[PDB]
Design an enzyme around this catalytic site. Structure first.
Site, PDB file in Angstrom:
ATOM      1  NE  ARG A   6      81.982  55.543  53.891  1.00  0.00           N
ATOM      2  CZ  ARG A   6      82.618  56.270  54.406  1.00  0.00           C
ATOM      3  NH1 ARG A   6      82.446  57.597  53.907  1.00  0.00           N
ATOM      4  NH2 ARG A   6      83.654  56.160  55.229  1.00  0.00           N
ATOM      5  CG  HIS A  31      60.352  62.709  61.727  1.00  0.00           C
ATOM      6  ND1 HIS A  31      59.169  62.642  60.964  1.00  0.00           N
ATOM      7  CD2 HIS A  31      60.970  61.479  61.239  1.00  0.00           C
ATOM      8  CE1 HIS A  31      59.071  61.670  59.975  1.00  0.00           C
ATOM      9  NE2 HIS A  31      60.197  60.935  60.265  1.00  0.00           N
ATOM     10  CG  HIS A  60      56.408  68.583  54.474  1.00  0.00           C
ATOM     11  ND1 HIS A  60      57.056  67.774  53.402  1.00  0.00           N
ATOM     12  CD2 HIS A  60      55.892  67.529  55.469  1.00  0.00           C
ATOM     13  CE1 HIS A  60      56.575  66.534  53.407  1.00  0.00           C
ATOM     14  NE2 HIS A  60      56.024  66.098  54.677  1.00  0.00           N
ATOM     15  CG  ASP A  97      53.532  65.564  62.659  1.00  0.00           C
ATOM     16  OD1 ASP A  97      52.844  64.401  62.655  1.00  0.00           O
ATOM     17  OD2 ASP A  97      54.494  65.841  62.470  1.00  0.00           O
ATOM     18  CE  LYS A 155      63.449  74.448  61.081  1.00  0.00           C
ATOM     19  NZ  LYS A 155      64.850  73.754  61.925  1.00  0.00           N
ATOM     20  CB  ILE A 156      55.902  77.587  64.278  1.00  0.00           C
ATOM     21  CG1 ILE A 156      56.418  78.821  64.255  1.00  0.00           C
ATOM     22  CG2 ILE A 156      54.739  77.290  64.869  1.00  0.00           C
ATOM     23  CD1 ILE A 156      56.737  79.337  65.736  1.00  0.00           C
ATOM     24  CG  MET A 157      56.857  72.478  67.895  1.00  0.00           C
ATOM     25  SD  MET A 157      58.077  71.150  67.192  1.00  0.00           S
ATOM     26  CE  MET A 157      59.156  71.996  66.277  1.00  0.00           C
ATOM     27  N   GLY A 158      54.356  71.987  63.776  1.00  0.00           N
ATOM     28  CA  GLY A 158      53.212  71.703  62.881  1.00  0.00           C
ATOM     29  C   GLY A 158      53.058  72.461  61.601  1.00  0.00           C
ATOM     30  CG  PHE A 159      52.648  75.841  60.781  1.00  0.00           C
ATOM     31  CD1 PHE A 159      52.418  75.741  62.351  1.00  0.00           C
ATOM     32  CD2 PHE A 159      51.878  76.091  60.116  1.00  0.00           C
ATOM     33  CE1 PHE A 159      51.247  75.959  62.715  1.00  0.00           C
ATOM     34  CE2 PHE A 159      50.462  76.724  60.491  1.00  0.00           C
ATOM     35  CZ  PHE A 159      50.420  76.402  61.846  1.00  0.00           C
ATOM     36  CG  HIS A 173      54.604  61.349  53.920  1.00  0.00           C
ATOM     37  ND1 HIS A 173      55.295  62.557  54.095  1.00  0.00           N
ATOM     38  CD2 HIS A 173      53.272  61.659  53.276  1.00  0.00           C
ATOM     39  CE1 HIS A 173      54.527  63.506  53.348  1.00  0.00           C
ATOM     40  NE2 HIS A 173      53.528  62.882  53.020  1.00  0.00           N
ATOM     41  NE  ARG A 175      55.057  57.123  58.277  1.00  0.00           N
ATOM     42  CZ  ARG A 175      55.074  58.194  58.003  1.00  0.00           C
ATOM     43  NH1 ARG A 175      56.449  58.570  58.411  1.00  0.00           N
ATOM     44  NH2 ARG A 175      54.305  59.308  57.789  1.00  0.00           N
TER      45      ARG A 175
END
Lengths: 364, 366
Positions: B350, B216, B255, B306, B249-253, B181, B331
């Protein structure tokens, strides 16, 4: 437009360190590193880096007390170290041990305990590095000594005795000079790992991986291998010229930021000169002078910190393969300062790519 | 001008993957992933990711035979896995195992062996993940089976029995959808480490560290914990309103790239639905539905991969805590493809910072 290597790209703001463009002074929380290296202990600098102020007397005593009580490796660690192959690169041992310690830490994933975690890693790293260096020479572990400071203790754990003050002092200075350096590759890797809200151990294990490389912390080891290969100050002129005609990178020279000399070098060169006076190191000092002068003529490129450090570590008695783990021992402070900064002002680090592959195609 | 989080910053070229914009079509080496997921095996997809072309049947047979011949762990590895604490996060076991593997690999520091190292990592990861999962249930390891392909072997190693096709098929689709990805954080971590000329094991160990975070790969585990806390589709709207009020944050939403749907989601949602009909999972299907609809109303934000993966893995029978390690297993192909591309067209990574600390000051007693 493609920012390969992120050269020139300002990626974040930091309060930890700065190169003052006017003087070419690297500062740690406002203080010039050359003055810190001359006048402070590694304990004071570590505190400074973490907290942003010099410690008071009482603060340093508490800090030093916690550091000394945190040096011991547990039975699980002695076992792992005895068991790991003794022919893998010493950076592998540091990478595995830190990952292992993370797994054992009940607070691993609690970001509010970062200060405690960073302190634990800073305190135990010398113990691991000394054991690994010694096991490869057939020698057993020497226990941490709670009467000795950080610099004296590591030396005691390596050699069984605390060496001459000139060596203690040069070693300590090296630890101060290597401690912090902005968004270098390994600090940046640590911040990328941290940007997903992953834990401090995962970030350090990632930074250790980045540091291993020949184009980062692997250079100090590579400088010494080269100096050995050269043999004599008489050979350096030809050795260099030949390597340059093959268009090869000269280790210990080259920097992404510094164009007119690394601000850490004068301090370390002087440290090298003192160690070289006390331990019969004129050979390496000569190779130093010549190789630097020939580089300044041919390329105009000036030495970076890894150049004086390589022969200084050799002269202190360290094994060449342990030079980068020893860098780790110091840079853990900068790393964990940056990890903490990233966690408290976080954004996911997630860039974009340009595509140069196969155009869309149907499954045959 | 501060590029925080490198948002919108183009840092390199890759030939490995892209999203066709008009169509929102993720492709691997030019082939749409939606199609690969429908018609290919993970073996075929791994080969494609590394080599740039689909394998012929002959090439596949051989590649598959190398993969099956590389699955085994030795006793020292088994002792390492049993010694590690039984309540450390499963990503710590994977992190440590891979680091140890590198230590044991005489070709660790040879970049010209990167292909073989990648293949070894891809092959052995499922063995490690299955051992660790089983160990937390108080169960012994089950050997890798050289008569089973990738997907069937992992399920057999986990459960002792290859389950029904719907479960195998959905798992294999998830492995394909997760493979690659672009310059996501964990991939980018791998490239940064690689950029110093450090080795593939150091790079992967870094990526694993990155993948772990709840922003992630840790999000797939977190989605399921969240669904279990919700309990019932009726509770969803309230649970969500509360979390949004707290600015969480809402997990799975969410990007960094996708704004109108994650290219990979509809495939995985259909796989979720298939497993759901055979595994008594209507409750999770309903919570999915309500939660997605409630998020579209409150924020306009759509699920990422996810979100469907979490309940899919749960109904497949995997333990919640192993969800992100299962992501690692897939992955590894993309990560290592990016490592090899980085190593072959390298420049040190760097960047620069802007300073907001103490102005230069005089050390006391100067």
């Amino acid at each position: 437009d493609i920012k390969k290597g992120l050269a020139g790209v300002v990626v974040d703001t930091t309060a930890i360190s700065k190169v003052v463009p006017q003087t070419n002074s690297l500062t740690y929380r406002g203080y010039p590193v050359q003055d810190l290296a001359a006048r402070c202990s590694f304990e004071q600098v570590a505190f400074l880096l973490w907290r942003g102020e010099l410690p008071t007397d009482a603060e340093l005593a508490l800090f030093s007390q916690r550091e000394r009580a945190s040096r011991r490796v547990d039975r699980s660690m002695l076992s792992l170290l005895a068991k790991l192959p003794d022919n893998c690169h010493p950076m592998d041992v540091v990478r595995t041990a830190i990952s292992y310690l993370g797994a054992e830490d009940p607070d691993e994933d609690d970001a509010a305990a970062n200060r405690a975690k960073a302190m634990r890693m800073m305190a135990v790293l010398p113990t691991i590095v000394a054991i690994d260096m010694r096991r490869r020479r057939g020698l057993p572990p020497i226990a941490p000594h709670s009467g000795l400071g950080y610099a004296q203790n590591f030396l005691h754990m390596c050699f069984g005795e605390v060496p001459e003050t000139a060596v203690v002092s040069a070693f300590e200075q090296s630890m101060i000079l290597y401690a912090e350096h902005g968004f270098n590759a390994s600090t940046f890797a640590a911040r990328v790992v941290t940007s997903t809200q992953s834990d401090i151990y995962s970030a350090v294990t990632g930074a250790i991986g980045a540091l291993k490389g020949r184009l980062h912390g692997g250079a100090n080891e590579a400088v010494m291998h080269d100096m050995i290969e050269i043999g004599d100050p008489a050979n350096a002129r030809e050795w260099l010229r030949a390597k340059l005609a093959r268009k090869e990178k000269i280790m210990g020279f080259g920097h992404r930021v510094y164009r007119h000399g690394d601000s850490r070098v004068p301090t370390m060169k002087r440290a090298l000169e003192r160690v070289g006076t006390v331990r019969d190191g004129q050979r390496w000092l000569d190779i130093y002078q010549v190789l630097a002068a020939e580089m300044a003529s041919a390329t105009g490129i000036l030495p970076n910190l890894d150049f004086p450090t390589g022969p200084a570590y050799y002269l202190m008695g360290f094994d060449i393969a342990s030079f980068t783990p020893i860098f780790v021992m110091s840079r853990i402070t900068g790393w964990t300062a940056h990890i903490m900064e990233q966690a408290t002002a976080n954004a996911l680090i997630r860039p974009l790519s340009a595509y140069c592959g196969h155009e869309q195609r149907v499954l045959p």
